[PDB]
Amino acid sequence: TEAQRNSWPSQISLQYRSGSSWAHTCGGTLIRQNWVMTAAHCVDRELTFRVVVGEHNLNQNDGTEQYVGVQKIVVHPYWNTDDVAAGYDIALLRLAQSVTLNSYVQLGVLPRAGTILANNSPCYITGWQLAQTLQQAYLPTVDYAICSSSSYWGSTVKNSMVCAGGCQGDSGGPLHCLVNGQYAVHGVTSFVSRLGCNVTRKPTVFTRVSAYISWINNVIASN
Template sequence: RVVGGSEARSHSWPSQISLQYYSGGSWHHTCGGSLIQRNWVMTAAHCVDRTMTFRVVAGEHNLSTNEGSEQVLGVSKIIVHPYWNSNNVAAGYDIALLRLSSSATLNSYVQLAVLPQAGTVLPNNYPCYITGWGLTPNGQLSNVLLQAYLPVVDYQICSSSSYWGNTVKQTMVCAGGDGVRSGCQGDSGGPLHCAVNGQYQVHGVTSFVSGNGCNVQRKPTVFTRVSAYTSWISSVSGGF
């Protein structure tokens, strides 16, 4: 996934989930997501805006083996942000909440994500990590959860003409863009983790990368900025 990333220590990101769809008699990983309540998952709108049967797997590390820590949870309701427009990802609002048909059991493998305070904007070069099972340089999904260090690129830089220009909005977070490490397809919907006051918080939901490739210089990975949507998240999921 995470291009230029390395394998994460097993279960070191316990709020990360695998969003999977059913096709041809089996389940396939399509996106990441974050467990924000025992029965709610936060992901990207573009991951769920087509009609499919989805499930969530929490406590996952290696997609290809049963490690005994997984919890498979059905999805009973998909709530996409009302302003999301699948024909205009650059408008923003690439966020969705999934209500689960049963509640996850919290343990050392499965934990709730901590969300940032409303309105929090991290400064340029703030250290963060992206995690996911997305496409690796050989074009395959990774079996194991990968992570990569992606420092924040602030809005002023990210929206400049040599970066993303007006494609990027203030409701987004940019990170990376060194031409080596980035997110990629299959990481979508997954988290950007940033430590604030000694605690990792999920500040971004992976939204898009450059059409020219996943790790293009001056085209950082773009995330939905979670702190711009905290009141919507609260109103839908009934608080954190």
């Protein structure tokens, strides 16, 4: 279904320039007035991007929105497209201009380092007669032990990852979760099966952001 106008005040739309406008690509959460977190495979090609805060429809302008380009991007030093299953599907893009945290654009909240999510732990996958506007869905997590089992993903799925459900559209769409009270972002889409999301016993897999927290700190601090 569709998410309330301003449901996720830290949701982001990395767009690519094509012709005379911008094309949506990956989701990405906000982490500070000048850093957005997304998937690494997103700032993959040499396109020139920009990010939009407080957005719902990447085709209209409700005024209650905010655009801003990215000075320079930084992907995990250990990320490599070839072997995506290796993890490291995570980048930190820096915004050229900071921003105002409007009643409609707050910051995001990540989990503690080393924190592991339990199974059947509710979570929602937000992103982008119908066309284009911020949607959302229910996507329960899958106990690591399981996803790893040869009956699901196998070795591929590591501990520095997160399995929900078991998709396309808002590539790199963030994964929110409710860990008894808190509601920070536990993951960002890494990759899906090779049939999409109709394939059971094989769930889409997200990156265990918490598996890269101390990292994020070293990064945003190194500026």
